[PDB]
Design a protein around this ligand. Structure first.
Ligand SMILES: CCCCCCCCCCO[C@@H]1O[C@H](CO)[C@@H](O[C@H]2O[C@H](CO)[C@@H](O)[C@H](O)[C@H]2O)[C@H](O)[C@H]1O
Ligand SMILES: CCCCCCCCCCO[C@@H]1O[C@H](CO)[C@@H](O[C@H]2O[C@H](CO)[C@@H](O)[C@H](O)[C@H]2O)[C@H](O)[C@H]1O
Ligand SMILES: CCCCCCCCCCO[C@@H]1O[C@H](CO)[C@@H](O[C@H]2O[C@H](CO)[C@@H](O)[C@H](O)[C@H]2O)[C@H](O)[C@H]1O
Ligand SMILES: CCCCCCCCCCO[C@@H]1O[C@H](CO)[C@@H](O[C@H]2O[C@H](CO)[C@@H](O)[C@H](O)[C@H]2O)[C@H](O)[C@H]1O
Lengths: 264, 332
């Protein structure tokens, strides 16, 4: 019925698609549960596919994306080697999800070629940015936003792009992406402001900068409002994706109301 | 000159790969690490041998390299023993891979060709790598099975892609039957080549053999079976004749260089023997029991070792002489 019902049912669809795949490739119970806990990553393909009208195609695209996004997160876990999962399972499963994603994605694009074009377009900016990020810590909001604009904006924006290519009409590609890129920074900040109490982890960068006073409350607030506005702007372009308006709001207020206080 | 094309191809592939790794933030370490993947940068050359256009062959050969290197980089990441930076490893892996997909698809006979191929058996490859790295094989049957995934399977996909992007006249299944045959030969070579690095202690097949759990003659047989298989696939019309010496070169390298390091005294096992009929009796003598041997026309005359000091004697037609006794002739 309501929209929260579709999101919830999409998340489930995607989680199940992902796990069937993880298990039928040899991944273990640990790994299958690991991937099933990737809550927001399994839900975001839903948002990126809001412009897609056919529900059949929407579902298909939605999960092909969940597959690749899960894959990239597995790789990120592989490089950091801190989750306690088996590196072999991690590398092998990761690769297998990605290959299924390409395949399913290309089976849905107008032009199969569009998928690799997109993934290539800024592969250097993303992988290059992922290294530099992990290399040096940022020391102010400006460095933070730049660092974040890669493992966040660039990373999620490619999927907005793919989502627009595997969806057909009723799709304004630039805007879908503009949306993915703003929403990403928002959730990135949140993830950077949440600490979940795991081994040798400590405090999110941005969180740290906030506590050292090196980054000000109002500026983080400013930023959040900039991203909110930018997201709303993108779901308004024709033909809009009105459904994302409450979503934009939900996650943005969430950081404002819930998370920020812990640091101010 | 085909050894000249080869060398030139490997340098080209090598530069393509180090431009990428460096342009993406890979450090000197890593750039140096990818430059050292010899066979991996050279093998794309053999896969494109059926390619008639030199520009296309070039492009496919170097794009195949990006991916193959990218795959080995991921394997180095799962093992975490290179001492290289995990991040850079991961990042660079993905960048090459993406470039690889883009390049291969720009040359493909069909837009779904590349992902069709990478997908066909992603499970067989991936689930297999996990099986392999989990249980050590414990006889040849097991060794051949494991090997046939990170080896035959892994490469065959590239053989298949090579044909998908090699313009016209590519006998697909053969290009690929070659990749899989040849891959296993090379995998045996790597399991028996000892590089003496951080835990790169003793190849499973090398171990197995030292443990006598695997029979030299059985390992010679397989090489021979693999050789035949590769030669046949290179013969299918329109054939890739130039790969024939390539096949022999690698197969023989294992037979002649690597095998001995692990068998030792005798490779075959069927210890050579001579059969004759001295003094009414039927006799057989080990070629290791032989002392002296000479030729008198088309007969072979010789002496051997019997009960302690006691000397034995015999003469056989050179047509009845084991290849191993005749070698003593042209040695004596
Ligand atoms: C989507 C594109 C944008 C990228 C930005 C990141 C988006 C996700 C925001 C928060 O993500 C969470 O990160 C946690 C920490 O990294 C994970 O919990 C981790 O720590 C918890 C600690 O309680 C454990 O329970 C979990 O098993 C373990 O996965 C959790 O799975 C994941 O949902
Ligand atoms: C080769 C590219 C492969 C794709 C990589 C991106 C895929 C999407 C995963 C994003 O996951 C987030 O990645 C951040 C960085 O990886 C982590 O932040 C952690 O690390 C950041 C940079 O190292 C710091 O800014 C944060 O404070 C710290 O919490 C964060 O927890 C994690 O949930
Ligand atoms: C290809 C189809 C079938 C797949 C199986 C792969 C076939 C194996 C061929 C030989 O592999 C060699 O193994 C070495 C292992 O040591 C590599 O050096 C690696 O290790 C060296 C130390 O031993 C370092 O100096 C190098 O940087 C590092 O690349 C070397 O370059 C590589 O050619
Ligand atoms: C998800 C799949 C993606 C990666 C696909 C692999 C791409 C090419 C990798 C092949 O490289 C070889 O891999 C073997 C196995 O990884 C290694 O053997 C080592 O490990 C084997 C199994 O763990 C044993 O059979 C051998 O004895 C031992 O030398 C070998 O040295 C290494 O050069």
């Amino acid at each position: 019925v309501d929209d929260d019902d579709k999101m919830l049912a999409a998340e489930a669809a995607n989680r199940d698609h992902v796990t069937r795949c993880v298990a039928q490739t040899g991944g273990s119970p640990d790994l299958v549960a690991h991937t099933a806990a990737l809550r927001l990553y399994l839900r975001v393909p839903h948002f990126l596919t809001e412009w897609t009208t056919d529900p059949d195609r929407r579902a298909a695209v939605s999960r092909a994306l969940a597959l690749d996004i899960v894959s990239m997160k597995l790789l990120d876990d592989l490089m950091d080697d801190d989750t306690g999962l088996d590196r072999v399972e991690l590398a092998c499963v990761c690769l297998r999800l990605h290959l299924r994603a390409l395949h399913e994605l290309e089976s849905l694009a107008r032009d199969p070629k569009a998928v690799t074009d997109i993934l290539e377009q800024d592969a250097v900016h993303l992988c290059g940015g992922q290294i530099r990020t992990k290399r040096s810590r940022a020391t102010n909001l400006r460095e933070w936003r730049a660092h974040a604009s890669t493992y966040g904006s660039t990373f999620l924006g490619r999927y907005g792009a793919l989502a627009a290519a595997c969806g057909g009409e009723g799709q304004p590609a630039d805007s879908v992406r503009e949306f993915a890129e703003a929403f990403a920074m928002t959730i990135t900040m949140a993830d950077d402001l949440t600490d979940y109490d795991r081994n040798g982890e400590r405090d999110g960068n941005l969180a740290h900068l906030m506590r050292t006073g090196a980054v000000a409350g109002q500026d983080v607030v400013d930023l959040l409002e900039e991203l909110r506005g930018r997201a709303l702007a993108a779901v308004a372009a024709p033909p809009g994706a009105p459904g994302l308006v409450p979503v934009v709001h939900l996650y943005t207020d969430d950081v404002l109301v819930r998370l920020l206080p812990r640091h101010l």
